[PDB]
Amino acid sequence: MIAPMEKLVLAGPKGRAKELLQSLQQAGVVHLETLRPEALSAYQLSPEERAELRRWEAVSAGAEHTLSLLGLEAEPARPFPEGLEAAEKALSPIQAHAEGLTRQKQELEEELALAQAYLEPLERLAALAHGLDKSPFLRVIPFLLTEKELPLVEEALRKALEDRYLLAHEAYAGGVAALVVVHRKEVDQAKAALSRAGVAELRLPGALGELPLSEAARRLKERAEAAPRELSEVRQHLAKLARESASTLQSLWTRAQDEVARLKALEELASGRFGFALLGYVPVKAKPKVEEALARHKESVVYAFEPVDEHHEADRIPVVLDNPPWAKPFELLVSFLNTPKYGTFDPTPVVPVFFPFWFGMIVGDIGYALLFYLVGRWLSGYVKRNEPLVIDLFALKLKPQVIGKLVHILNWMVFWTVVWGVIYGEFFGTFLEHLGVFGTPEHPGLIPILIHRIDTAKTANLLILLSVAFGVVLVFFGLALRAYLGLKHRHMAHFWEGVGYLGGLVGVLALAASYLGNLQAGWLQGLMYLGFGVFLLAVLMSRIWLMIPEIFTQAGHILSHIRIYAVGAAGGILAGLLTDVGFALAERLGLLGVLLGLLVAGVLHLLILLLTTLGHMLQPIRLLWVEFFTKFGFYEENGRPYRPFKSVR
């Protein structure tokens, strides 16, 4: 249900307002409100307070960056209550050590990569260059190049001197080390011509392509020998530093998040010229703890605890769910929808009443309900492990309270699922083929089942009538709720619209059942006449040209409930056909490969379940959200959210 969401107004001096801001941040049960306009100041606190807030925000940002560099995740925990400068001095040692480690390990890894990129080929080039390394008559253009286009480079070598220009590829032929040595200027022209034919002198980065090749090879060999143990020790030091400092970093980050939230909340105040006043919204069910915190203040200051505004424009007033403990898990599904109009009825209990019953009538496979209960047992074991439900495949880490609400909703739906599967007479699909635990007139093995589920000529008319009747009762409840909301909000347009929708729906249903159904339209002639007259009368009471299209849309929304019976019968017929074909090709074809054929049939049925049962469960909820929400509106400004101070801890 919609909560009261009582409004609270507080006032006093400035330092007491800062202490009460710390209190109402610790007692974060009231969403904020500006209320700046009438005879108030802006409460721009201080540029010194702004600088301290910038220091705390920089501390929190550096803590998040250091947690990211540490690889750990930022978890809210118990705060570290200390000064800002002391927390900065504590963090900056750890942040400096982490920055030095993250620079050094990345540099060692990049140095190992660049050393292994040209380790053996530069060694072979320095082995082949044993006569003119820095001899003052010849340069050295070495090219770790491609395959035997050495004649194409020998064309440029013959363009250079032929009795000079030692130019060959020695070994390590992945990059064939075509070193060339002729002269200074003639070798410059020869290297230009070889690059025109396709060649490149090995100009590597750092010092390996910036020093003499013997010293470059010695330094690269030293780096390749040292970088593995250095990277291992740096990873060990980083892991030990994370395991020894992440707790203090997370406590400091939680305290910094709390202080920065208090700093951001101090900006949204409204001063009174060495006085301060503010407005907020807290629940009337939470009024006791809020009043205890107000008495816990230094003054028990003046808290005008009025209620919210009435159904005429309660839009800045926040919204919150008022459901039972059994109805508490339906709030998670209603969280897919927006917040209410603060006077709009939350149908989330009727959602847990109807979508569980519709999902039970849809899902009537005992094997599927057994798989649901087994998955509930597995999720209950994971919730006994008490971790956040983290599916990196789904990339979703979820709260275990959400998992518990899902398990409770799964149990409350599986009750009706097993109930309607017994009503369908379906055990793991169709086990009545072999052992007739239900009773049919064709194959009586035990007592009868309510639904035949293979025979439908007696079942089609009754299933269609029940699926029509459930949607008609839901449409009547939605129109009555719309008229009641128009009456309670004094919105006579909405009340007359709901009344005309109900009258036109009654007249249209009477006319359809009279003309298209059976005979004897005498009791329904005046019914259809009065329904059309009431629809035209409330249309004149509206005069907004809300035409027959809206009535036909409501009629189609009521008629859409037969798709649930269609989908349930389709899933039952598909599971029965799969199990029957599997049992036929397993036992009726052989009676000895029954285990392998039953395994193949169960695998195909599980694949069909994973393909279709999610949509079968969703389309009842989809039709419920399409019908019950829109019949009550549920798209009117979405109200306001209950957004108090967090104090996440």
Partner: protein
């Protein structure tokens, strides 16, 4: 209620501003009287 509290804090600001301006005016008057008495003493 709270709007009355806001207007009460504003009217308290107005009364304190009136009190501070009157204190400044009476202080200027007392300083002028002290200057006249010192001029009489010097004469």
């Amino acid at each position: 209620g709270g709007l009355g509290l806001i207007k009460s804090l504003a009217e308290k600001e107005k009364q304190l501003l009136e009190r501070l301006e009157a204190a400044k005016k009476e202080a200027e008057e007392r300083v002028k009287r002290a200057e006249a008495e010192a001029k009489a003493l010097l004469e």
